[PDB]
């Protein structure tokens, strides 16, 4: 219940929102993704189709067309990364 | 403004209200990395000194000492995995 707790909380809520509607409730589909990302994200409301498809495909290391916990982790890490830097110019 | 963006604002401020305390105000001394771990992490609180000055070192990665924005993020990736898989047994 500690600060950088309830940050995790969050994060992982919010993978888990998406995650739990179709298909395995522990990954993330196609449609799951896009929509965490266009209503979860200032930076996704601002993509186009276009755009988001290929972040789709980016995030997807493995890809099995599914994003799991590791690999949302490893976007949500690029983007602590980018909201820094921003912060910082 | 949206949650992600939320979320990671806070993991963001977490790590500057410490890091700007003393030496680079953009990183992260023994010091400031201890007293991080054991005020805003619930596990932080349960590690005793020894604990924690192994798990610095880990965090460490290039071992200069100091805890750079990416390395926190890496720390905060593998504590977003250990609480999904927590709260998945
Ligand atoms: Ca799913
Ligand atoms: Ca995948
Ligand atoms: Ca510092
Ligand atoms: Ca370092």
Redesign the interface.
Known sequence: ????????????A??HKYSGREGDKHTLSKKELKE?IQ????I??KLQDAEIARLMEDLDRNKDQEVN??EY??F??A???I??EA?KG
């Open positions: 219940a500690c600060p950088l707790d309830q940050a995790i909380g969050l994060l992982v919010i993978f965490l209503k979860e994200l200032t996704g409301s916990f590791q982790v490893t949500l890490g983007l602590a990364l909201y820094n912060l």
